[PDB]
Design a protein around this ligand. Sequence first.
Ligand SMILES: CC(=O)c1ccc(-c2ccc(CC[C@H](O)CC(=O)O)cc2)cc1
Ligand SMILES: [Ca+2]
Ligand SMILES: [Zn+2]
Ligand SMILES: [Zn+2]
Length: 162
Amino acid sequence: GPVWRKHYITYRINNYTPDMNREDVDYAIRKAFQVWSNVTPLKFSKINTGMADILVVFARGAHGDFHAFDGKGGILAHAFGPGSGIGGDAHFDEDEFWTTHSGGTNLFLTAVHEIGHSLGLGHSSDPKAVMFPTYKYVDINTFRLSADDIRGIQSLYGDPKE
Ligand SMILES: CC(=O)c1ccc(-c2ccc(CC[C@H](O)CC(=O)O)cc2)cc1
Ligand SMILES: [Ca+2]
Ligand SMILES: [Zn+2]
Ligand SMILES: [Zn+2]
């Protein structure tokens, strides 16, 4: 399938959810990218001007991409695989209640799953995998990618360099 054709990839946060402060949204997103860069040769950097490779957007309902959101619950976010235009972009349903821990939908865990899609990964049947299709909370301090997630992403990008 299509894959990013460079190792240095930029992201930009288009707009912000009012559910968490700016520092907390930035940290969740940064840490989510870090989960994937830790096990591949990919490098991610945040930019604030210019066209980014990956745009992170919060939106609700119909928002211009033929994939309208559905209110609180159900689909929590979605993302586009590598390709032209919006390819790579990650959209989070603003009707969810985003949190730093577990009092609602954890942004970090959700961002890990969606960035997986943005990098080219599909769903897993392994219930311990972050790419499993269904959200579940796990202690952020105890969180680790499953072996399944690791094999999947390394099959697309290889493992870290010496
Ligand atoms: C086990 C673990 O750490 C874990 C992390 C994240 C998830 C996760 C799965 C799905 C979703 C949301 C799926 C979204 O509504 C639509 C999609 O992208 O498929 C968010 C988080 C599941 C397990
Ligand atoms: Ca929803
Ligand atoms: Zn969208
Ligand atoms: Zn998914």
